[PDB]
Each structure stands twice: as structure tokens, then as C-alpha cells.
Design a binder for this molecule. Structure first.
Ligand SMILES: O=C1CC[C@H](N2Cc3cc(C4CCN(Cc5ccccc5)CC4)ccc3C2=O)C(=O)N1
Ligand SMILES: [Zn+2]
Ligand SMILES: [Zn+2]
Lengths: 826, 374, 28
């Protein structure tokens, strides 16, 4: 019933995997990076990285491992998607035509089976005899690596240990042996099993169960010289190999948790380690050749190298050049100097690759052109906290403004040529009683500073204290110039005051434009919030002044401008405030809901409300009555991340398993039963996690209405930095473009031979249906990159409905100009 | 074994006419059948699926029902009691459903076309942003399995930070995700049920949150029309949330025995001495009473004349007070002897005779409808 | 009407024996 079109404005920028090897040819060294659905292949030069190929898949890349079976010139690439698509890929070049061929493929999903808490784990035996997958608790899938197995037929093996945390394949074992850390009631332990392809069963491993530390989180297989494995936990690093079990907790590491690793020496003598706070370490495995050729491990030593961006994964290339794959901030290349610099760091940044990071809020502003809008986002977390300015190249031009603290919300106040941003920085409890900052960030290094006067809850204060060392986050409201982007003022909120919502608008008869923030007093023993404020600020003459301070009974999750009035949501209440002439907030309306009013979008007198469990609710302000009345609803439980009003009748939301959905006001609604029920009319597996929805376009808005083929324009920012745009269509275009999609699928070569319809099929852990009401804009726009012979294959025997009378064979030239019309929406 | 239909499918299964009480899945239902058509129809179920329907009536007199629960028989025995030959049958609630049609047969037994409502199971809220490297820090180093070490919110605080570490990737904080986290919601309930009545939490309550939510829906002190709301919810999370909102709305106390008489509200409580509002007092015959002091109480009759004999609050004379409806003992009315006494009249209710309930608005002048939260 | 039949549990006074017995049974 709703015909919507969805297209990528910015591919996912966040890195979630990386491996090195010889994939293009046996000689040159490759670096392969996974950016969610994208896969980038590089060649390691002495200068930097020479890009070679970049391909996309019909799936979220969950496993990516190189390996060279016996009788192969170069490595093969194994990938496993989020929907459990398996495949082995080969790099093939014929002069200058680069193509990734699908040697074998298949889906390895099991009907029935609990997806493990630890997620998908994929490991390949170092002798390339087999692939092991840990997909479900209590099972271990084994794919035997035969030239015969082109469909990847596999078998599961009963696994008595249910809560497995990590598993690797061990080097230098008679039979393929797996080593894993699991948990049972007595704590965590490490155990080994041999895998028999003949018996299709488990056998006793080389060295039986051993007890490990409480927080054992990582297993590293150590190459052939050593044998055995290294287990990294929260405070210890241990090496185990049957006879020996060495564990060290050097003081340099106790302060942080290690989350990623990578091997430096091919024999395993050194490893790179990165923690949650950006630190970088080096681990040394001391050897002893003991004549024979039997090297025995003697000790373990750790050195602090320096600080990098918060690393999701690491990979050593060569000549001390290391690729830092980051999810929260920019990915980097760093040099490892043998001799320190003046700061003490042996690491030096070489290149910086932009990562729009986690986009947690954004807005569109025209800013300077007065014709072309620009997108300013809240990207990254912690020291990687940043703003980003995205605009069209006049391709995408991105300018970065680092904050060194986490930004939460952003909104634009044209009246004072600046932005309002809510941010939070981490401080540590001081022995004096106060708190100590970790580094100077945007809120600390501001020109002007202020703290709100402890008034309402200065007398109403609960008795509790914070222990030394505890991390406690302080919230600020930042004012940022719209040109230079420096922090003009930083208002610090009360202690334990948590800032949730922020808006900039004019209220009532008042012509002043205000910064309104909704807060919530967050205490640890207090589970649901019982105290919060709505503060009205005014920014005038470089100084920020508190105008009004309105206490509420709970958390102000959302606020919107509602035709001259302030529409706030306190827990389950939808309260409407009015701006008195005495410049104070006076309650006019209340509406008490069945759900917590977390998501709030408004169009005129309609209000769209949503909670975290995909409970969609539609309210309307009745002017004569002076209160709220419910219109319709659709409560289907599922996790929901953001929501937006397309038009008066359509509603767009993003829900669990990276899906998109459209709920629609039921036409032909005769009963008050079906009037008051919204029908799900569109479902789509986007592959990304949507955090924020925004009306606007990054193109020249086009003054004279030049028969815009689409109606509406909604942008959205995701966790992996992907920025997308959604727009509505007409019935004839949807029906046409849909038939375009199904013809393209027949001629298009899918990486890994994944069926497009399967990739976009609405998927959750329980339910999996096909996609409706959504056109894959990225698939349509790919029509321009195929050859004219493939276009003639696509258009062959294809009619439109133009006039309901002139349906004729679409020429490839008619159709080419059509897709060009669609590329112009971003 | 176990006969279970598929989700969202249409099924046509019989309804027993004698039954009326709402059946929550999981709890057991014992029945006593005398009529031969009831027995004959049950006997035929033992051969086939062994499942029948138990409706959740909104008005039992008119027999109005929109939902209900399937009941699977698991015990059958032809007994004798009081010179009557009766069959005693035990069934268990299984699936929920939505009422479609109520065609009544030639017998008194009536069939019911119905659509199976599925139990909505959601993966971890953070599972939605992919199980990456901070995943290995998602699992916990066992539980403390200590009543006093796991009451340590130091443990529950470390639980929140670690389970919801990825909260900073989204637009909401960790503490919001705790408000939708089952384990947290469960322990929030347990702490309040133990507040109502001391009892062993480990044995009495199931560990699974689906089993927990339903089990609590049965034992909650609420009207069966209100209980229909809980039967509608498909997500154990929304169910646990709703039960917490109810528990917070049970601000009044009624007669534990008849449960038809609202005695007093929590507002009327007050601490007479530093001892507290509630304390344990003894009478001259060795009987121990946990007594709650409240300013005002109603729907009570007095017994005998006032006496200062062995009064727990000198300056006041007690008069035995009992329920208007069932005459079970509720406590005493305390009346001052002199004029300089501060409250002059108050009430001493014994705790074991009370039971918390939602304040009903039987006065139809201002009946604002109770809205439950999800 | 001097009520010499007392309940040791709650203290109720009653004027004939058989009325107190009806009372102490409701306590159980
Ligand atoms: O404040 C409170 C609330 C009441 C509660 N009581 C008091 C109480 C007294 C008696 C017996 C005591 C002995 N007399 C003999 C007597 C006869 C005539 C005149 C004076 C004495 C018979 C009743 C039995 C039960 C209860 C009971 O539950 C309590 O102890 N304190
Ligand atoms: Zn009673
Ligand atoms: Zn008595």
C-alpha cells in the first residue's frame, strides 16, 4: 500500500574485521577489510596501501578468514554472513578485469538451535582440513574441506559444554584439535577435543581441562614452534601447553581490559594487544631451542607501545606498519618506532581513514548555501567523540570536528548561528571527594563555562556515596559555532543529572529562541527515574542563561515543538506545556499511555509515539476539547531503534535484526476496530542499525518544482556510519522498479552466490518473510554499471504502464535515463 | 507426551461450560465432572490431542470472552467422594489464543474456533548490534549464588555496565535497557514479593522468565478481568513490566479472607512511636500479632466494649474489630482516654489478616480507567 | 451483658459461650 524507495548515501565506514595474506597473488601481500556489507582488498606497498578491488555482498560479513589448501597458488577467502551464508572466494584477474569467483557456497543454518551468547565463531584448521563453526550452544558444525564439497555439506557434533566463550584450532597437532574456554557453575575452564572426520565425532584432546581466570575472554592459538595456546583475561595473560601453564598479571595491564590481538612474528614469538581505551601493547614469548628442535616457552613480557584509536581489530602488515581497524573512531595506519619520541610513545600515526562511527543523532542544515543542505552528525564515542559535516562534493565531502568526549544529541539554532549539543565526559572519583577528568575534552576546554544552580534537588537529595576509582559521567550542554565549530560555552548539569532530550524552538508569543533540554536524575538504587527537569536556556551575547527550571516526576525522554507548545514525554505520560507570558511552563494537557513514550515525531496535530518494543501509537490533539485523543496503534513486540512520520498516513520505523518497517493508517477502515489498527505494509532487511531519522536532502532542494519523481525525503544514520535516504514513490514506479529488481537478479553476479531476495527478506530469530513495500535503490542504481548487452538482457520483454495503453518494450536508453533520474536524489 | 499446535494457526477445540476461572499457562487445573456428556467428551480427548479451551471471560454472566488458554489433560481417575461417582481430571495450561467464534453444539458442550497466539521471544536487546569483540566481555563469571552477595547492588551495578556496555552506540543509556531486561525485571519483582511475604525465593519461583511471568500472573492479588490484560501480552518482557506496574498500583489493603472489602490505604499508615508503623506485640495469652498502625479504616464492625487491659498503646482503649462481610478478625480500633492525646482515634490491624490490592473505584461517579504499562 | 466469654486470640467479648465458639473457629 505504501511504495517506498531506499538508497545508500554513504557506505558503512566502520571496520568490523581485517586479515592479511596472499589472496590476489602468491607474491604481493594483501590486506582485506570488512565494513559490514562491504569488503575492501588492498595490496601492501612500502609507501602505504594500494587499493585493488572493493566488492559488496548480500549479507553482513560475520566471518572472514584466509587459508591456502594443498595445491593452491594463492589463499582462498572464506566468508560467513549474518544470515548464515557460507562461501569460498578466489581472486581472479584477466589482464585488468578483476572478479571474485565463488568456488563453493551454501547456507549452513540449522532449523532449531539457540544462537550462542558469544555470537558466530568461525575457525579453519591450520592444515586446511576442515572448517569449524560455533553457531549454536551445544553444537559444533564441521565442514570437511574436499574438492567435492562445493555445496558445503556439514555435520554437527554434540558439544557437552554449552557456554563456550572462544575457540581456536591448535597448531602442531596429530589430528585437528580445538581449544576453547567454556563456563559451567565452577567458573571458567579451558579444554581441548580432537576432531575425527572419519568418526564424525570428538575424541580426547592432548591435555585435559584446566581452570582459568574468572574473566577469560580470548583464546590465541600459538604457531607450530610453541604449540598450545594463550588465554587473555581481564587481569591475566596465561600460556597453556599441557605440561606448562604460565600466567602473568604485569602492572602495566591491570588498568584495562584487552579486546583484540594479532600475530606479529609468523612463528608466534610476538603478538599485538589492544585494550578498550586505545592503548597498544606488545607481547613477547621467550623461547629456548633445547637442542633437538623442541622450543619450550620460558616467559611472557608485555610493553606499552602507545595510544591509538579505539581498536576493534588489529593487523600487523610489515616494517612496523600496523592497521588499526576502529568501530568508534577513525581507523589508522601507525608506525612502530624502535626508539621513543618526546611524548614517550613509540607509535606515530601515518594515515587516518574517516569513520562516521556510531551516528547517534544528526540534523540537516542549509548553513551557508541557502539552497543545498548539509548534514551534521554526532559520531563516535569517548575520546573518539566527534562531529562530522557531510555535504555533496559540488561524491561526499566530510569534515571532522573532534570532541574527545561522547556527543549524544544535536540541534541547530539559526537565530544564534550555532548548534546545541548534549555530551557526556567520563571522570573518575577523586580521593578528595570530587572528580578528576581523564583528558581535556570539548566540555572542559570551553571558552565560557557554567554549572546549573543546585536548587530543586539541592534539598531533595538521596543519601549515597561513590567509592574511589569509580567512573562517573558528567553531562554538558555544548554551544558550537556553525562556522569555526569551536565550543563557545559548556554548561555542566547537576551531579547525577542525565540529559536525554534537546530542542531549539520558539514558544508561545515569545520571539526569543531557546535551547530546551529534558533531563532525568539517575540514581543507582532508584530503578525507574523519579526526578527530572525541563530547563529553558537562552544563548545571548556569548553567554548561556537559565530561563526557566520546571521540575517533573520522572525522565524527559523526548521533546518536540508542537504548534507553539512544548510536547514532553515523562515516563508514560505525554504532557503538553505552555509558555506563559511570565516566561514559565504551565501544564495544559496530559495523556497517560500504555507504553513509555521514548520515540516522538510530530506532524501538525498528529503525534507518533513509540517505546523500545515496537509499540507504535498515534495520538491527535483535539483543539476544542483541549486534550489528547488516541487514533490508532500496532503493538507487535520486537526491539525498535527509531521512528519517523513519512506522511499523514505512513509511519517508518527501524526494528530488530536491522530491519525497516512501514505502518499505515488503514484505508477502507469502516469499523472503529480497523480504523484504530495500523497495518504493516512494508518490511525490509536493511542490514544496518538505524539510530536517528531526519527530514531533509543533501541535494539542491530545487526551487521550481521540477516534477520530483519521489515524494518526501528522509535521511538516517546508522551504527556502522552508513547514511541512508528513504523516499516515497508512486504505484506505477514501484510496480515497475520491482520488476526491474527481479530481472537484475538474474543477470547480476552475486558475491558468494547469495540470492538477493534472501538478503533483503525480513528476518528475525523466529520469523522470516519476504520484503514488501521497499525498492533496493542500490540494486536499481547498479543497472548503470552493467554492459549494454546485459541491459538488453534485462529490458528484454519489459512493459510499463504509462497511460495504461502505451506499455511498450522498454529500451535500455529509456531505462538508463530513468535510473539517472533516481541517482539525483542523493 | 505433549500436544502443541503451531503459532497463528486456526484451531477448533471444545470449551467446558462449568469452567469460568482464567487459566494462566503453566499453572495446573483440577476438575470434578459429574455430567455424562462432560465425561464422554473428555474421554474422547484422551484418545486424541487431550486439549480443550478455558476462556478468559470479561463478563462471566453473559459469557463474553475474547481470549483464553488451552488446557492439556495429564491426569484421569474415576473416583468416589461423598457417595457420588465422579471423575477427577487434572489439566495444565499450554497455549494462549484469541477467540474467533463461539458456536454451541447440540450438547451443552460448545466448540470454539480460535487462533493460537504465539509466545514472542526476543534475543538480547544488545544482540541487535552484532556480537563482536566486546561480546566475550558480555558473559559473567558465574553468579555469586549468595542471597547477601547477590542482593549487593554492587553486583547488579556491575551487571548493568557489562551487559549493556554497547548502550553508548545507541541513543539510550544503560539504565533504560535495564528497564526492559528480564533478569533485572525478575529480581525487581522478587524483591517486592519478599516484601509482601517472607518465603524462599529459590524453590518457589521458576528461573525461566517466561515461566516466571506466567507464574506471577497467577499469584498476583488481582481481579480476573484485570488478569485478562496480562493474558494478552505475548512478550515475557512486557508481561514482567506490566506486573511491576500492577504491584506499584496495589496501594490499598483488603481482608485476606474474603478479599471483597477495602479496609485502608497505604496513605493512612503512620509511625506512632519510633518502633515503626509495624511491630510485633504480644497479648496476655501468648499470642503474637504483627500490628500495623493506620489513621483511618472502614468496612469494619466492633465487638464488645473498649478496654485498656494490656493495651499496647497506653492512653488508648482497644475495641475488637472484624470484617463487615465475613466477620474474620482484622484488628482493633484504638480510642484515646484523655483529650490531650494526639491522634485521639486510630486503628491497629494485624498483618496476617490483610492482603494488598488495587484501590477499586466502585463509586461510579469518578471511575477513571486503570491503564497498565508495557 | 457483661460478656464473660473472652477470646484469647483477639480479645473479643461475648455474652454466651456458643457465640465465642463460632468466633474462635473463624480465626483458623
Ligand atoms: O492492645 C491490645 C489489643 C488487644 C490484645 N488482647 C487483650 C486480651 C485480653 C484477653 C483476656 C485478658 C483477661 N481478661 C479477664 C478480664 C475480665 C473482665 C475485665 C477485665 C479482665 C479476659 C480477656 C484475651 C485476649 C486479648 C487480646 O488479644 C492485647 O493484648 N493488646
Ligand atoms: Zn473479610
Ligand atoms: Zn478472637
Amino acid at each position: 500500500m505504501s511504495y517506498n524507495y531506499v538508497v545508500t548515501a554513504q557506505k558503512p565506514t566502520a571496520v568490523n574485521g581485517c586479515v592479511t595474506g596472499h589472496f590476489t597473488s602468491a607474491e604481493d601481500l594483501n590486506l582485506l577489510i570488512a565494513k559490514n556489507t562491504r569488503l575492501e582488498i588492498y595490496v601492501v606497498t612500502a609507501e602505504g596501501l594500494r587499493p585493488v578491488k572493493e566488492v559488496g555482498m548480500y549479507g553482513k560479513i560475520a566471518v572472514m578468514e584466509l587459508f591456502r589448501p594443498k595445491g593452491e597458488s594463492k589463499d582462498l577467502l572464506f566468508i560467513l554472513t549474518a544470515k548464515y551464508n557460507a562461501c569460498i572466494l578466489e581472486y581472479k584477474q584477466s589482464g585488468e578485469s578483476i572478479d571474485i569467483i565463488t568456488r563453493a557456497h551454501g547456507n549452513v543454518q540449522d532449523r532449531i538451535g539457540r544462537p550462542s551468547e558469544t555470537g558466530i565463531i568461525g575457525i579453519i584448521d591450520p592444515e586446511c582440513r576442515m572448517i569449524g563453526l560455533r553457531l549454536y550452544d551445544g553444537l559444533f558444525k564441521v565442514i570437511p574441506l574436499d574438492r567435492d564439497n562445493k555445496e558445503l555439506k556439514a555435520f554437527n557434533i554434540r558439544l557437552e559444554e554449552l557456554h563456550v566463550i572462544d575457540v581456536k584450532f591448535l597448531y602442531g597437532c596429530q589430528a585437528p584439535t580445538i581449544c576453547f574456554v567454556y563456563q559451567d557453575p565452577q567458573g571458567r575452564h579451558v579444554k581441548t577435543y580432537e576432531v575425527s572426520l572419519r568418526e564424525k565425532e570428538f575424541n580426547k584432546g592432548p591435555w585435559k581441562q584446566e581452570n582459568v581466570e574468572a574473566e577469560a575472554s580470548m583464546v590465541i592459538a600459538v604457531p607450530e614452534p610453541f604449540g598450545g595456546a594463550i588465554i587473555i583475561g581481564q587481569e591475566s595473560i596465561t600460556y597453556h601447553n599441557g605440561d606448562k601453564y604460565l600466567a602473568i598479571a604485569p602492572p602495566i595491564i591491570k588498568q584495562s581490559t584487552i579486546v583484540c590481538h594479532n600475530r606479529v612474528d609468523p612463528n608466534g614469538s610476538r603478538y599485538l594487544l589492544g585494550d578498550m581505551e586505545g592503548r597498544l601493547f606488545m607481547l613477547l614469548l621467550e623461547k629456548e631451542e633445547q637442542m633437538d628442535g623442541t622450543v619450550t616457552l620460558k616467559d611472557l613480557r608485555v610493553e606499552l607501545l602507545g595510544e591509538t584509536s579505539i581498536a576493534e581489530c588489529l593487523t600487523y602488515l610489515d616494517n612496523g606498519v600496523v592497521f588499526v581497524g576502529s568501530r568508534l573512531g577513525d581507523s589508522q595506519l601507525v608506525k612502530l618506532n624502535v626508539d621513543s619520541n618526546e611524548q614517550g610513545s613509540y607509535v606515530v600515526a601515518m594515515e587516518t581513514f574517516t569513520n562516521l562511527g556510531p551516528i547517534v543523532d544528526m540534523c540537516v542544515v542549509d548553513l551557508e548555501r541557502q539552497g543545498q543542505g548539509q548534514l551534521v552528525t554526532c559520531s563516535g564515542a569517548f575520546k573518539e567523540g566527534s562531529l562530522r559535516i557531510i555535504r555533496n562534493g559540488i561524491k561526499l565531502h566530510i569534515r571532522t570536528v573532534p570532541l574527545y568526549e561522547s556527543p549524544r544529541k544535536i540541534c541547530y539554532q539559526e537565530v544564534s548561528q550555532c548548534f546545541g549539543v548534549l555530551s557526556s565526559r567520563i571522570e573518575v572519583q577523586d580521593t578528595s571527594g570530587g572528580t578528576t577528568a581523564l583528558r581535556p575534552s570539548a566540555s572542559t576546554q570551553a571558552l565560557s563555562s557554567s554549572v546549573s544552580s543546585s536548587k530543586l534537588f539541592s534539598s531533595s537529595t538521596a543519601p549515597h556515596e561513590t567509592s574511589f576509582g569509580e567512573e562517573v559521567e558528567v553531562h554538558n550542554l555544548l554551544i558550537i559555532d556553525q562556522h569555526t565549530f569551536e565550543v563557545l560555552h559548556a554548561h555542566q548539569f547537576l551531579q547525577n543529572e542525565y540529559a536525554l532530550s534537546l530542542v531549539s524552538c520558539k514558544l508561545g508569543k515569545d520571539p526569543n529562541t531557546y535551547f530546551i533540554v529534558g533531563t532525568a536524575m539517575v540514581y543507582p538504587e532508584e530503578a525507574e527515574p523519579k526526578q527530572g527537569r525541563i530547563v529553558v536556556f537562552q544563548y545571548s551575547d556569548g553567554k548561556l542563561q537559565t530561563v526557566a527550571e520546571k521540575e517533573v516526576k520522572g525522565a524527559v525522554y523526548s521533546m518536540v515543538e508542537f504548534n507553539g507548545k512544548l510536547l514532553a514525554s515523562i515516563n508514560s505520560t505525554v504532557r503538553l506545556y505552555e509558555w506563559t507570558t511570565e516566561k514559565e511552563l504551565r501544564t495544559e494537557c496530559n495523556h497517560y499511555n500504555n507504553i513509555m513514550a521514548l520515540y516522538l515525531k510530530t506532524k501538525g496535530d498528529f503525534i507518533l509515539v513509540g517505546d523500545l518494543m515496537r509499540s507504535v501509537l498515534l495520538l491527535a490533539y483535539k483543539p476544542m476539547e483541549g486534550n489528547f485523543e488516541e487514533i490508532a496503534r500496532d503493538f507487535n513486540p520486537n526491539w525498535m531503534s527509531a521512528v519517523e512520520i513519512l506522511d499523514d498516513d505512513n509511519f517508518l520505523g527501524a526494528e530488530n535484526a536491522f530491519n525497516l518497517f512501514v505502518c499505515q493508517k488503514d484505508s477502507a477502515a469502516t469499523t472503529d476496530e480497523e480504523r484504530q489498527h495500523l497495518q504493516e505494509v512494508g518490511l525490509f532487511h536493511l542490514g544496518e542499525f538505524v539510530n536517528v531519522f531526519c527530514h531533509g536532502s543533501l541535494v539542491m532542494q530545487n526551487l521550481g518544482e521540477t516534477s520530483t519523481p519521489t515524494q518526501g525525503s528522509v535521511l538516517f544514520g546508522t551504527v556502522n556510519g552508513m547514511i541512508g535516504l528513504v523516499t516515497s514513490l508512486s504505484e506505477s514506479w514501484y510496480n515497475l522498479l520491482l520488476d526491474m529488481q527481479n530481472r537484475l537478479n538474474k543477470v547480476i553476479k552475486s558475491v558468494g552466490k547469495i540470492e538477493h531476495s534472501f538478503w533483503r527478506s525480513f528476518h528475525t530469530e523466529r520469523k522470516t518473510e519476504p520484503a514488501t513495500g521497499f525498492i533496493d535503490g542500490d540494486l536499481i542504481e547498479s543497472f548503470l554499471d552493467i554492459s549494454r548487452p546485459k541491459m538488453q538482457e534485462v529490458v528484454a520483454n519489459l512493459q510499463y504502464d504509462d497511460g495504461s495503453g502505451m506499455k511498450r518494450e522498454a529500451t535500455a536508453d529509456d531505462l538508463i535515463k530513468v535510473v539517472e533520474e533516481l541517482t539525483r536524489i542523493h | 507426551g505433549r500436544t502443541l499446535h503451531d503459532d497463528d494457526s486456526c484451531q477448533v477445540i471444545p470449551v467446558l461450560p462449568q469452567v469460568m476461572m482464567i487459566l494462566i499457562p503453566g499453572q495446573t487445573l483440577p476438575l470434578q465432572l459429574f455430567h455424562p456428556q462432560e465425561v464422554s467428551m473428555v474421554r474422547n480427548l484422551i484418545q486424541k490431542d487431550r486439549t480443550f479451551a478455558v476462556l478468559a471471560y470479561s463478563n462471566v454472566q453473559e459469557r463474553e470472552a475474547q481470549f483464553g488458554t488451552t488446557a492439556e489433560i495429564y491426569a484421569y481417575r474415576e473416583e468416589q467422594d461423598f457417595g457420588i461417582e465422579i471423575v477427577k481430571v487434572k489439566a495444565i495450561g499450554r497455549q494462549r489464543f484469541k477467540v474467533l467464534e463461539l458456536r454451541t453444539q447440540s450438547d451443552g458442550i460448545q466448540q470454539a474456533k480460535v487462533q493460537i497466539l504465539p509466545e514472542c521471544v526476543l534475543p538480547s536487546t544488545m544482540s541487535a548490534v552484532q556480537l563482536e569483540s566486546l561480546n566475550k566481555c558480555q558473559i559473567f563469571p558465574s553468579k555469586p549464588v549468595s542471597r547477601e552477595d547477590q542482593c549487593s547492588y554492587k553486583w547488579w551495578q556491575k551487571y548493568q555496565k557489562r551487559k549493556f556496555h554497547c548502550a553508548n552506540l545507541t541513543s539510550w543509556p544503560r539504565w533504560l535497557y535495564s528497564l526492559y531486561d528480564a533478569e533485572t525485571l525478575m529480581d525487581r519483582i522478587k524483591k517486592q514479593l519478599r516484601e509482601w511475604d517472607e518465603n524462599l525465593k529459590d524453590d518457589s519461583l521458576p528461573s525461566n522468565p517466561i515461566d516466571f511471568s506466567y507464574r506471577v500472573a497467577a499469584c498476583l492479588p488481582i481481579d480476573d478481568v484485570l488478569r485478562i490484560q496480562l493474558l494478552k501480552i505475548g512478550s515475557a518482557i512486557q508481561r514482567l513490566r506490566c506486573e511491576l506496574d500492577i504491584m506499584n498500583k496495589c496501594t490499598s489493603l483488603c481482608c485476606k479472607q474474603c478479599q471483597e472489602t477495602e479496609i485502608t490505604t497505604k496513605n493512612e499508615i503512620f509511625s506512632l512511636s519510633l518502633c515503626g508503623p509495624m511491630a510485633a506485640y504480644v497479648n496476655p495469652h501468648g499470642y503474637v500479632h504483627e500490628t500495623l498502625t493506620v489513621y483511618k479504616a472502614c468496612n469494619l464492625n466492633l465487638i464488645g466494649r473498649p478496654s485498656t487491659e494490656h493495651s499496647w498503646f497506653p492512653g488508648y482503649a482497644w475495641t475488637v474489630a472484624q470484617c463487615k462481610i465475613c466477620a474474620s478478625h482484622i484488628g482493633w480500633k484504638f480510642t484515646a482516654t484523655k483529650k490531650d492525646m494526639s491522634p485521639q482515634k486510630f486503628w491497629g490491624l494485624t498483618r496476617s489478616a490483610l492482603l494488598p490490592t488495587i484501590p477499586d473505584t466502585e463509586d461510579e461517579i469518578s471511575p477513571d480507567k486503570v491503564i497498565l504499562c508495557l | 451483658s457483661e460478656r464473660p466469654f473472652h477470646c484469647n486470640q483477639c480479645g473479643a467479648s461475648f455474652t454466651q459461650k456458643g457465640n465465642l465458639l463460632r468466633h474462635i473457629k473463624l480465626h483458623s
